Design a protein around this motif. Structure first.
Motif, PDB file in Angstrom:
ATOM      1  N   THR A 156       0.865  -1.141   0.000  1.00  0.00           N
ATOM      2  CA  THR A 156       0.000   0.000   0.000  1.00  0.00           C
ATOM      3  C   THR A 156       0.900   1.187   0.000  1.00  0.00           C
ATOM      4  OG1 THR A 156      -0.083   0.423   2.373  1.00  0.00           O
ATOM      5  CG2 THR A 156      -1.530  -1.316   1.465  1.00  0.00           C
ATOM      6  N   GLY A 157       0.364   2.316  -0.465  1.00  0.00           N
ATOM      7  CA  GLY A 157       1.029   3.606  -0.421  1.00  0.00           C
ATOM      8  C   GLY A 157       2.169   3.747  -1.385  1.00  0.00           C
ATOM      9  N   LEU A 158       2.198   2.910  -2.422  1.00  0.00           N
ATOM     10  CA  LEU A 158       3.258   2.962  -3.435  1.00  0.00           C
ATOM     11  C   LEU A 158       2.863   3.920  -4.532  1.00  0.00           C
ATOM     12  CD1 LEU A 158       3.786  -0.885  -3.894  1.00  0.00           C
ATOM     13  CD2 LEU A 158       5.212   0.682  -2.516  1.00  0.00           C
ATOM     14  N   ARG A 159       3.815   4.171  -5.423  1.00  0.00           N
ATOM     15  CA  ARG A 159       3.583   4.980  -6.592  1.00  0.00           C
ATOM     16  C   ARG A 159       2.622   4.329  -7.554  1.00  0.00           C
ATOM     17  NH1 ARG A 159       7.882   7.908 -10.779  1.00  0.00           N
ATOM     18  NH2 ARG A 159       6.140   9.099 -11.652  1.00  0.00           N
ATOM     19  N   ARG A 160       2.677   3.009  -7.641  1.00  0.00           N
ATOM     20  CA  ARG A 160       1.783   2.239  -8.487  1.00  0.00           C
ATOM     21  C   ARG A 160       0.851   1.369  -7.635  1.00  0.00           C
ATOM     22  NH1 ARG A 160       1.093   4.974 -11.362  1.00  0.00           N
ATOM     23  NH2 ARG A 160       2.696   6.097 -12.556  1.00  0.00           N
TER      24      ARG A 160
END
Ligand SMILES: C[C@@H]1O[C@@H](O)[C@H](O[C@H]2OC(C(=O)O)=C[C@H](O)[C@H]2O)[C@H](O)[C@H]1O[C@@H]1O[C@H](CO)[C@H](O)[C@H](O)[C@H]1O
Ligand SMILES: C[C@@H]1O[C@@H](O)[C@H](O[C@H]2OC(C(=O)O)=C[C@H](O)[C@H]2O)[C@H](O)[C@H]1O
Ligand SMILES: [Ca+2]
Ligand SMILES: [Ca+2]
Lengths: 884, 896
Positions: free
Chosen positions: A266-270
């Motif tokens: 979670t909370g990634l760029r993708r």
């Protein structure tokens, strides 16, 4: 033949809980009703039962019962006891190496030797979810003067392990108690002899994966031993588990939980997928990577992996939280908070895992929790009972003696700070502390709601109890109290007031900490608006004038959860920290002071088993308290090693070897007697001895001329008899009164001993007691007409009103009853028209806002409450007559 | 002949109960007053901080002495020399009621305010020699800096036994001392090093500068303590502090006093030898007297059962307050070393002051503004039963785990630009070996010192603690700042359009949210306090503290400009405080002040220095300008703005485009260096324009670089649309980029070029240059503003290609706004409003509320706005502010 049968009913202590993991409760029975081993018990099925106490004729006095973990939870539980003529199981297995306990939900294996307390924890399925439970301890040998001194005062660290000597097993179907004892032995670091004796108890219940872990230690170190870390540790096997499927949780503030994964998705760029991300947060096994969105799944190598997490609770008010990819890198600080509720989980969706936690975590600071190597095949989960992030634990004395040289100086110092100092007496050698730890096992990462529930369970463990009324009927726990007239109503409101103020002061004065939590202080400083934490005898209370009695009797009468929890905490402190459990002074406790062990007055009135009696029985014979009560049987040995009256006795007597030993008939004897009556009641290994020493000393006191009015006696350590004091070899008559003699359990112990001895009571003892109760505050004439002198140094008249009340009730004497109520309402202690309220203080007068009652001290409130409770129980009939 | 005008200044919030003298800024209309020919009076000590192109005063600073008389407002009337030189009126010259004198010799500088005399050695390991009150009485001595460190750290707590730690202690060693002396206030700046006192040889390190502000009639001394971090992988700071001796020889133990500030106006009140709460009463008045810090009556007058036994009342020499988290502090005392500590009832958040002294000897208080927000911190009294006590403020507590500034990760096996850029695609971090270093970051701390002739009342101490945590500020009126045009034309005051009024409510919503997030998400700490995070994780309900470039924001998309312009328009206190703290972080910790990358700052990431994009858009001195002028030329920021003039040298050591550039270029020695015309140049330009405005030691240089580079951009065929150029470090000129040596025409667009302060600098620059603006530059700026979101065909027509990767349409709406104002084109103004309300960023129909989250989903309860990120709010709010300013005449028009 006949059937004698009856029912007794047991209720939840506060609100009915939503979860319980098995419970053990107590139940009293009337004198002469039920024979042990003959009487059957049923619950509303067969009910695990066993005896904790017996009447003098050997019938059942207190029992203990156990029920399995069940999701059926009822409001009341009814135990029916039926005599002889009336009409889910734990499996333990034995190997050479180790003992296994299997509840139906967990299998835990305890080695019989070595440095591993628990071999492994399996779930139903058989998967290992934790291994190698082990005690850790670390210490240092010096401490630097200040932070500047660290550059020129090296520190040598030593780590240690729990080494097992004995493993014991108390197996029943409903619950099994594994008791592991040992010592802490070196591993790494600078070399050190075995120290810090432990005993660790494990309560497993049928159908539960919750293990309650009572962890006790004795401090046997010296001046150069500074405890640095103290904890319990498990390995958590993670090998077959994708980092994105490995889960970390800590309990937060109130009902919070922190919810992370070793590899966050979670909370990634993708976006791998909305479903996938929600699954990670939920502690679920993520979908196959072929369903993820490839701009994420092809890049997992670039998403850091988080091996270590550390929560540290270093004040009662704040905690830090931080995590680290691996050693050799800096930590990333995490958004933290005030008061962590003190559970942590490490595990996985596939591999399952383990939560460990500590009851009252932040109130027993400095504590902590660690996950480590959660990127490896094996992670560790550590609970710190004492955190290395804290300053080292320094038990050494707080002052150097101040140039005091001999009893003359020490008694002088006593006139100013109320501390009676002596060199070598300001010592923590042999104190203890029991920590209530909890292990929960899981086949897979559980829900956050579940972890918060088990966290709340831990911090308020469900208790079943008897009806106060029923307890009273049986007379199994004293007669000196009854259940709750306008005048009486305001007595109860006044007890409520005392209770609300003391419960409140715990929080406002911040009476928390590894050892401190449980106690409270003695006298207040009105100028500074603090309790006298820094003035000698006016600091920690250490059971002075029997607050333990007040608070426990206040619970009995009411059935209040708050009352039970306050008194429980008190009991877990004063019985552990305020007494010695090894060495020459074993079985004594320490007089109120700045540290819990600073004062030279080592006396049995502190270590006074009557203080633990009510909790021993109500908890279902709590085994740790059981052990503590057995220790106090060696209290008589100490009078040969140490004269409590050594500084002030006028008669030139001293201890010699193979001689008789002196002790007071109120202070000291009240503690010995109570020890002996508890062991007798329990029928423990030393009960015949206990019955002989109680029975003899009672006859001793009866066959003294002035009975209790005699100051003390001379006791034989081999023949167990009681004769006149040094200055009356011929039992002609000694008069030596003290205002302390009655206020530490004497009347409670004596009323219980009189009732228990029944028709075997030594001739004239009851009358010697009635004589004390009567003449303590009779007129100087009635005193000189009876004993030849009047009683000089009388005081605590409010506190002694409950004696007059005892005698009043027993002799059916209405005149004495009114003198009792007159002493209560119009002598000393807390007068009825005293302020009876709190004043608020804030601004620049004090560090933080506080409520105060400068007009009371703890000596007053303990004896006020005991007087109220007892005066109402004995002579409420004469109360209305007193008001008009 | 005569020219005179007035400007009023107000307290930021409520009228203070006490001040210790104050400085403030005032702007003046272009061309009105000449420097050194202009007198100022108050209804006053004055000096210039800034100048207009023609040399007239742009900004001045002003200082007032400590006074019991505090007003609701203050009016400064200026007057040219013509106003006295023309009138034949006879007027009185009289001394001010209070006035600082300084005596100066080779040993030491001494500053006397009339309420204290303090001495500053010119060499040595002692910053302040001593502090005397009025009377001559010494109340404290040997003010000194302390530092403590360790040579390594264990893997974990277990590893202590097999991983030994070598502890070192250091002193502040003085190299230079300076003075800016004036009658009403005096500033002693002291520069130095930390050298070894105990432990193995260690090269001198941890450069400091400490600034002492002293004010006439004041025993209070404000202290700006700034340090640069020049340690390596082996230097773990452990202990960082400021220590004084307090002479107690001659005070009875029962007349020596300890005070610590507690929670919300609380004070801890104790004596070294306590006469209260003993078994015996010395007498009610005597106890009352001790708790008040008064000298006690003669021992002969006490009830004698106490005076006989003072020997048996212990004596308390050491006291220690520790704030090792933002939420809880410990407090303990002890008789002396070799004994144990006695614990003291403590609590949540200490306000950061300690006093040590006596009723007769007097003494000293020391404190740290924002104490608990900058944890871990502490206060120690030492040896208060001796002839000499020590009082110590710990900027970093040794009771904390040591400060570890090393990388958070090992690189994860990333071998080269291709792997680094591929990790950028998932965590948003731009990693590179050796780039993840704190070498050269700094931190400034605001400390106060309070001298007392005698133990002061507790009301006074709490009152001073509050003073310290909320230092009074005098600011000019927003209207007046705006009227003068001395701080940009791209903002204006809050119009009757109902639409405008919902825009204002939305900026209040953004501000209130960012203010609360600081407390809710505990963004506090020795280095962290002042910054905030970048993007949110809606699943975990946290800011992405642990994921590449989504953590600490490090001024990405110029939030510093929004929050400063938000203060300017409104005069809001909370607003100033928010921004001040931001500026104090961002321009100190997020930028490098020494080394090869001096004058670059670091791109948003998990640490403040973790990321490899080292760029001028972070150091961007436009982000500090508003505070520089509003504070009265805060000298530390002043200093910081100077260092950035070295930024242009970095382009020879480091290409910011190294990994993505397709033209084969690389720096090489004695060669023209490459930089961007939008992001990079806007940082450079801003630093030069400020040095020029300041007429500082590099202004002629500054003026030349700015002008030549402006002229160079003008001369590029496609001006700003080119992307970059080649700068000559000897001729200070700007030519075309490596792909276009003919200047035939190049095209390279980035959505980032305008959003790091470009339009702000460019407008200010244009108005500064005035008549001498190089030819064709304003046109090139208009071209960029207009073509950015013109049609694809319009772009193709001017520049031969459409602009393909344009985003941040809302953010750039303000460029159209500016161009609409300058060309008076209604149709373009309406485009500005259309991109504002109907492109990207925050749409008017976005949720525009907070959601509360609690229970088992999170550690603590939090308010969230998952629908926004900081990039969005920073540009939304600039858009709002700049569109209102340029094109509000067209707003109602858009709404119909
Ligand atoms: C080339 C550099 O690449 C990265 O370090 C980083 O860009 C990534 O982050 C951001 C951002 O944080 O704003 C935006 C980009 O889309 C990401 O690739 C740096 O911002 C970037 O430096 C800048 O690069 C562009 C090149 O077109 C601009 O010219 C800008 O002026 C540069 O300073
Ligand atoms: C003989 C013992 O001597 C002292 O150590 C203690 O006495 C002092 O303490 C108390 C008290 O109850 O705490 C009351 C006395 O009046 C005081 O002098 C012990 O209490 C003594 O038994
Ligand atoms: Ca205690
Ligand atoms: Ca930052």
């Amino acid at each position: 033949f006949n059937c004698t049968s009856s029912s007794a009913t047991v209720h939840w202590l506060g609100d009915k809980p939503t979860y319980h993991a098995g419970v053990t409760f107590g139940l009293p029975w009337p004198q002469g009703k039920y024979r042990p081993q003959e009487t059957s018990f049923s619950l509303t099925s067969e009910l695990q039962s066993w005896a904790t106490g017996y009447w003098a004729d050997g019938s059942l006095k207190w029992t203990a019962h156990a029920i399995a973990e069940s999701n059926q939870i009822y409001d009341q539980y009814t135990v029916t006891a039926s005599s002889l003529g009336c009409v889910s199981s734990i499996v333990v297995t034995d190997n050479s190496d180790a003992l296994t306990v299997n509840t139906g939900e967990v299998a835990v294996s305890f080695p019989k030797g070595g440095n591993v307390i628990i071999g492994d924890i399996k779930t139903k399925s058989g998967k290992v979810i934790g291994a190698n439970g082990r005690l850790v301890l670390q210490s240092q040998d010096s401490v630097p003067d200040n932070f500047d001194n660290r550059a020129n005062s090296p520190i040598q660290y030593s780590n240690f392990d729990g080494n097992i000597n004995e493993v014991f097993v108390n197996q029943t179907s409903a619950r099994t108690l594994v008791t592991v004892r040992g010592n802490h032995t070196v591993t790494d670091g600078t070399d050190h002899d075995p120290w810090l004796p432990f005993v660790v108890r494990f309560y497993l219940y049928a159908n539960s994966a919750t293990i309650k872990v009572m962890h006790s230690i004795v401090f046997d170190g010296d001046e150069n031993d500074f405890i640095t870390g103290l904890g319990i540790r498990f390995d958590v096997p993670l090998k077959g588990e994708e980092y994105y499927d490995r889960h970390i949780r800590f309990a937060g503030v109130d009902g919070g939980i922190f919810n992370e994964a070793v590899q966050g998705i979670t909370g990634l760029r993708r976006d791998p997928g909305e479903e996938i991300r929600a699954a990670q947060f939920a502690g679920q096994k993520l979908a196959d990577t072929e369903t993820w969105e490839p701009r994420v799944s092809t890049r997992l190598k670039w998403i850091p992996t988080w091996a270590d997490y550390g929560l540290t609770q270093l004040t009662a008010d704040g905690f830090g939280l931080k995590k680290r990819t691996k050693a050799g890198q800096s930590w990333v600080n995490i958004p933290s908070g005030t008061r962590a509720e003190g559970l942590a989980y490490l595990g996985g969706a596939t591999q399952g895992g383990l939560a460990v936690g500590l009851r009252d975590f932040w109130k027993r600071y400095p504590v902590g929790l660690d996950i480590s190597n959660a990127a490896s095949d094996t992670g560790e989960l550590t609970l710190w009972l004492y955190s290395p992030a804290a300053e080292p634990l320094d038990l050494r004395p707080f002052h150097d003696g101040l140039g005091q040289d001999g009893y003359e100086d020490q008694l002088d110092a006593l006139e100013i700070t109320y501390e009676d100092w002596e060199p070598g007496f300001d010592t923590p050698y042999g104190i203890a502390r029991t920590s209530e730890v909890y292990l929960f096992a899981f086949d897979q990462t559980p829900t956050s709601d579940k972890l918060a529930s088990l966290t709340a369970y831990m911090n308020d463990p469900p208790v079943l109890v008897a009806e106060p009324k029923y307890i009273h009927e049986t007379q199994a726990l004293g007669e000196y109290w009854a259940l709750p007239s306008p005048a009486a109503a305001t007595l109860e409101d006044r007890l409520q007031f005392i209770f609300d103020f003391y419960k409140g002061q715990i929080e406002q004065r911040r009476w928390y900490g590894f050892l401190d939590y449980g106690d409270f202080m003695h006298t207040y400083d009105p100028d500074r608006h603090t309790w006298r934490y820094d003035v000698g005898g006016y600091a920690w209370d250490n059971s002075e004038l029997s607050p333990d009695l007040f608070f426990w009797l206040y619970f009995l009468r009411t059935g209040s959860k708050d009352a039970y929890r306050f008194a429980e905490a008190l009991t877990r402190h004063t019985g552990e920290v305020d007494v010695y459990h090894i060495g020459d002074w074993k079985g004594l406790g320490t007089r109120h002071g700045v540290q819990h062990w600073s004062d030279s007055a080592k006396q049995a009135r502190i270590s006074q088993p009557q203080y633990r009696k009510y909790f021993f029985y109500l908890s279902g014979g709590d085994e740790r308290v059981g052990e503590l009560l057995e220790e106090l049987l060696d209290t008589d040995k100490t009078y040969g090693e140490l004269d409590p009256q050594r500084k002030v006795r006028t008669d030139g007597w001293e201890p010699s070897p193979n001689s008789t030993v002196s002790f007071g008939l109120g202070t000291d004897w009240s503690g010995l007697a109570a020890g002996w009556l508890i062991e007798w009641e329990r029928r423990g290994p030393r009960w015949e001895e206990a019955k002989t020493k109680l029975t003899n000393t009672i006859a001793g006191i009866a066959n003294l001329t002035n009975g209790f009015v005699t100051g003390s006696g001379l006791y034989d350590p081999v023949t167990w008899t009681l004769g006149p004091p040094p200055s009356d070899p011929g039992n002609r008559g000694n008069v030596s009164i003290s205002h302390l003699n009655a206020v530490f359990g004497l009347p409670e112990v004596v009323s219980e001993a009189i009732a228990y001895l029944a028709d075997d009571i030594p001739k004239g003892f009851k009358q010697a007691w009635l004589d004390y109760c009567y003449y303590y505050h009779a007129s100087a004439s009635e005193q000189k007409d009876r004993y030849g002198v009047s009683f000089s140094k009388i005081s605590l008249l409010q506190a002694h009103s409950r004696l007059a009340a005892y005698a009043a009730y027993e002799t059916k004497n209405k005149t004495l009853a009114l003198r009792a109520w007159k002493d209560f309402y119009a002598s000393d202690g807390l007068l009825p028209d005293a302020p009876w309220n709190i004043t608020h203080v804030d601004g620049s007068d004090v560090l933080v806002p506080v409520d105060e009652a400068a007009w009371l001290a703890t000596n007053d409130i303990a004896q006020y409450g005991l007087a109220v409770i007892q005066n109402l129980a004995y002579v409420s009939d004469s109360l209305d007559d007193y008001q008009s």
